[PDB]
Design a protein around this nucleic acid. Structure first.
Ligand SMILES: [Mn+2]
Ligand SMILES: [Mn+2]
Ligand SMILES: [Mn+2]
Ligand code: NA
Ligand code: NA
Ligand code: NA
Length: 324
DNA sequence: CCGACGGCGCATCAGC
DNA sequence: GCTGATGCGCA
DNA sequence: GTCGG
């Protein structure tokens, strides 16, 4: 049902980027997700309508698309200059719905206008512009494996007790990835631990030293967002620049962290809701119970991802089964 | 009908 | 100059 | 936009 999920996804993007209606955005993605998981070719809106997250308005849109092969609402939007331009500009990392809208109001609507007005861009936005095409390329699993070996090894060089784990799409096992996500732990940093200084900085700084990390979007004591690039050969094609995220998490919370940052995004949304549907509340850090009123108690002990799955009564699903 | 739908780390900057 | 307000991206 | 109060 690629035709239908593509349509719902494009509608989602509009609601997020133009209408700034984040809950409609989520509603469309939730519908696109449940439809992609449907093992039958959808013959009608009423057929989709049986699925949870698909409602009256989306069934009708499905009837139209199935009849005409297109959607008039999407046509008009694509034709609309302000809508189209705002949508476009949000493809730049660091330009969200609000910046995109402001730019367009000022007559800035293309990559070229962004070039002409670099003085109006902040540092993250200049980086996103610089790497516009690069950031929209997928990363082949082969290069993700080369990236993994560099990160793991340079982490070793700073200190051998660090544990770095590549999570996200890679850990689900996908053949290409949108970026690289790295969870970092160290024995000195736990949920108590007196706050250990420069733990993440040391690793970011080394990765810069070996010229693997080329740009910084944001950097703090627990979270790094930036740009990296595989080393080239002699005269060879430069690899594309890639997005990399590094999160430093307390060691005692590594499994909740690995669970969350493996994803998928929709999966974790799905886990938290079913968590409450069993008396638990999950975040990135801990799994806790609520009682009868519903404040959450203390973090239950966890030594594996499945430990978390047990608590809320799901059959365990290997990383590869979480792409939602 | 109506309201909930997750929240946080980091960067920027308008308004003092 | 500072900081409350807000934007951004994110599994 | 959807669905469980
Ligand atoms: Mn069936
Ligand atoms: Mn990723
Ligand atoms: Mn990421
Ligand atoms: Na439904
Ligand atoms: Na953007
Ligand atoms: Na992505």
């Amino acid at each position: 049902n690629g035709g239908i999920t593509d349509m719902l996804t494009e509608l989602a993007n509009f609601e997020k980027n133009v209408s700034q209606a984040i809950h409609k955005y989520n509603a469309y993605r939730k519908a696109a997700s449940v439809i992609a998981k449907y093992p039958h070719k959808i013959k009608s809106g009423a057929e989709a309508k049986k699925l949870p997250g698909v409602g009256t308005k989306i069934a009708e849109k499905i009837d139209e698309f199935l009849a005409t092969g297109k959607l008039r609402k999407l046509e008009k939007i694509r034709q609309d200059d302000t809508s189209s331009s705002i949508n476009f500009l949000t493809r730049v990392s660091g330009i969200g719905p609000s910046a995109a809208r402001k730019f367009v109001d000022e007559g800035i609507k293309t990559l070229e206008d962004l070039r002409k007005n670099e003085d109006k861009l902040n540092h993250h936005q200049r980086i996103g512009l610089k790497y516009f095409g690069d950031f929209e390329k997928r990363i082949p699993r082969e290069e993700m494996l080369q990236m993994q070996d560099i990160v793991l090894n340079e982490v070793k060089k700073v200190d051998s007790e660090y544990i770095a784990t590549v999570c996200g799409s890679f850990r689900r096992g996908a053949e290409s990835s949108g970026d690289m996500d790295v969870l970092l732990t160290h024995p000195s940093f736990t949920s108590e631990s007196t706050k250990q200084p420069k733990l993440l900085h040391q690793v970011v700084e080394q990765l810069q030293k070996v010229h693997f990390i080329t740009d910084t979007l944001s950097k703090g004591e627990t979270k790094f967002m930036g740009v990296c690039q595989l080393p080239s050969k002699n005269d060879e094609k430069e690899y594309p620049h890639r997005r990399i995220d590094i999160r430093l998490i307390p060691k005692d919370q590594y499994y909740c962290g690995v669970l969350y940052f493996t994803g998928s995004d929709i999966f974790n949304k799905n886990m938290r809701a079913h968590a409450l549907e069993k008396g638990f509340t999950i975040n990135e850090y801990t799994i806790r119970p609520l009682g009868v009123t519903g404040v959450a108690g203390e973090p239950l002990p966890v030594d594996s991802e499945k430990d978390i799955f047990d608590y809320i009564q799901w059959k365990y699903r290997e990383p590869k089964d979480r792409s939602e």
